[PDB]
């Protein structure tokens, strides 16, 4: 429950659109979204939104 | 290992946007988007795209 690759504190629950990388908690994903130039920190693809993943 | 909830034949690979339901193979998710009133079969939310999820 500590597997977010950004903060390593929260649980992974979010994926970025459209690259689909599912490696982030929602707080870190939201922070990615309101950067000046939102982009995936892993693959650098531009980010248009973050979604919570439901499996 | 998870089975697509539509066909129960292929692995789960894709999620719908924006509801984030991650329960579909890419073929079944593509079929969802290509319909004329696209909506998630699980929660009935309108679907604006389907993406492959990378975990
Ligand atoms: Zn985080
Ligand atoms: Zn990415
Ligand atoms: Zn399927
Ligand atoms: Zn849904």
Numbering used by the authors:
A (entry chain B), B (entry chain A): 605 to 659
Provide the authors' original text about this structure.
MEX‐3C, a novel RNA binding E3 ubiquitin ligases, contains two N‐terminal heterogeneous nuclear ribonucleoprotein K homology (KH) domains and C‐terminal Ring finger domain. It plays an essential role in the regulation of energy balance because its mutation moderates adiposity and develops energy cost. hMEX‐3C is a unique RNA binding ubiquitin E3 ligase and plays a key role in mRNA degradation, such as post‐transcriptional regulation of common Human leukocyte antigen serotype A2 (HLA‐A2) allotypes. Ubiquitination of Lys‐63 linked ubiquitin chains to RIG‐I by hMEX‐3C in stress granules is important for the activation of the IFNB promoter and RIG‐I‐mediated antiviral innate immunity. Ring finger domain is responsible for the ubiquitination reaction and defines the largest family of E3 ligases.
The Ring finger domain structure was refined in space group P1, with eight molecules per asymmetric unit. The Ring finger domain of hMEX‐3C forms stable dimer in solution as determined using size exclusion chromatography method. The core Ring finger domain adopts the typical Ring fold, consisting of two antiparallel β‐strands (β1 from Residues 618–621, and β2 from Residues 652–656) and one central α helix (α1 from Residues 630–638) [Fig. 1(b)]. It suggests that the two Zn2+ ions are very important to maintain the stability of the intact Ring finger domain structure and contribute to its E3 ligase activity. The cysteines/histidine (1st, 2nd, 5th, 6th) coordinate one cation and others (3rd, 4th, 7th, 8th) coordinate the second cation. Therefore, hMEX‐3C Ring finger domain belongs to the RING‐HC category, as determined by the consensus sequence [Fig. 1(a)]. Moreover, to analyze the roles of predicted interface residues, we mutated them to alanine, respectively. In the self‐ubiquitination assays, mutants of I610A, I636A, P645A, and Q648A abolished activity, while V609A and K639A reduced activity [Fig. 3(b)].
